[PDB]
Amino acid sequence: AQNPNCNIMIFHPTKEEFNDFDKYIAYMESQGAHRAGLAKIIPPKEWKARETYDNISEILIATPLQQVASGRAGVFTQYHKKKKAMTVGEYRHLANSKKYQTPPHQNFEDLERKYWKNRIYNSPIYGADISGSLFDENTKQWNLGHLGTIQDLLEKECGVVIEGVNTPYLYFGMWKTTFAWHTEDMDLYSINYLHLGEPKTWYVVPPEHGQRLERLARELFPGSSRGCGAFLRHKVALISPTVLKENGIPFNRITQEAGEFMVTFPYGYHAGFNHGFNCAEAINFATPRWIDYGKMASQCSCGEARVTFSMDAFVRILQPERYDLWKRGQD
Ligand SMILES: O=C(O)CNC(=O)C(=O)O
Ligand SMILES: [Mg+2]
Ligand code: NI
Ligand SMILES: [Zn+2]
Incomplete structure (x- = not known):
């Protein structure tokens, strides 16, 4: 078995290997990459997503989200408070302000320490989940707006044509903006390209061990767990690396x-x-x-998770026994 310790793998495809997206995913899996739950892909040096990022300031962030935490430093939930609209240029200025800017730090490990010590005491504002793309239409390789759609894949595999569309989303971040523990809708893959700016640190649990995380989460968030048998679908719970190691x-x-x-x-x-x-x-x-x-x-059928239009057909075709309950949760 390839990658039996479930380490995160890093790939360096050549320009030739960058042509055929599906083929390269399958190659990474042949080497055991999926066992980790996450892989990094460094594009060939010849590739670029677009020419420059100099003209993005007028994009609108219609609903910036202030991420308010509750709990303890290593075990907390966050809720999203909606804020007034602002442009990407306004949001960038806000991110760089004294109130929001990244503190001085030595290296990524020092900043990680500071994140877990202090995250809960601040409420950063996240420009998350904006429909749109920054890939140039002339970028032919790994262009996240030109991938094969999930509806086409289901139709190809299973023979059933379904409604729905599959488009990308932009995320404008600042120091301490946080993505909570989750798997994708319908346990899909995701792909994420960091277009510009400061880094993003990721934590991941191997798929073969996901239920161990779920059991811990039920223990640590006991009210949430009574409320919903799949409450991690709500995308609000954080658990630190130190707490994961202790458990x-x-x-x-x-x-x-x-x-x-x-x-x-x-x-x-x-x-x-x-x-x-x-x-x-x-x-x-x-x-x-x-x-x-x-x-x-x-x-999730409790009402909280509420998702896109296109998930209906996935549940309907792949999970017909669950469909009626899930749809009630949507309504
Ligand atoms: O970047 C983020 O805030 C969250 N991204 C993801 O969960 C993803 O790409 O699957
Ligand atoms: Mg613009
Ligand atoms: Ni995700
Ligand atoms: Zn729920």
Whole structure:
């Protein structure tokens, strides 16, 4: 078995190897990359996403989210308080202000220490989940707006045509902005490109050990767990690396820098934080190997998780027994 310790793997495809996206994912999996739940892909030196980032300041962040924490430094939840609209240029200025800017630090490990010590005492503002793309239309390789759609993949594998569309999302971050522990909708893959700015640190649990994280989460968030049998789908719970190690949960960590891709694999729980002002693009995708994960994915039916239009058909076709309950949760 390749990669039996479930380490995060880093790949350096050549320009030739960068042509065929699906082929390269399958190659990474042949080397055991999926066992980690997360891989890094450094693009060939000949590649670029677009020419410059000089003209992005007028993008609108219609609903910036202030991420308010509750709990203790290593075990907390966050809620999202909606703020007034602002442009990317306004948000960048806010991220760089004394109130929000990254503190002085020695290296990524020192900043990580500071994050986990102090995150809860601040409420950073996250420009998350903005439909759109920063890839140039002329970028032919690894262009996250030109991937094969998940509806086409399901149709190809299973023979059933379904409604729905699959488009990317932009994330404008600042110091301490946080993504809570989660797997993707329907335990899909994700791919994330860090277009510009400061790094993003990731934590990940191997898919074969995801249920160990779920059991810890139920213990640590006992009210949330009574409320919903899949409450990590709410995307509000944080647990630090120190707490995971104390509880024997297998995990890994890595820092993504501008110009790098990350891929999350089906049922790979992940969480993390941004170092300072940045902009990432991400989208979900599927392969043949995903179908079995999609058929077994948990679902939230309590009402909280509320998701896109396109998840309806995935539940309907892959999980017909669960469909009626899940849809009630949507309504
Ligand atoms: O960048 C973020 O805030 C969150 N991203 C992801 O969870 C992802 O790309 O799968
Ligand atoms: Mg602009
Ligand atoms: Ni994700
Ligand atoms: Zn729920």
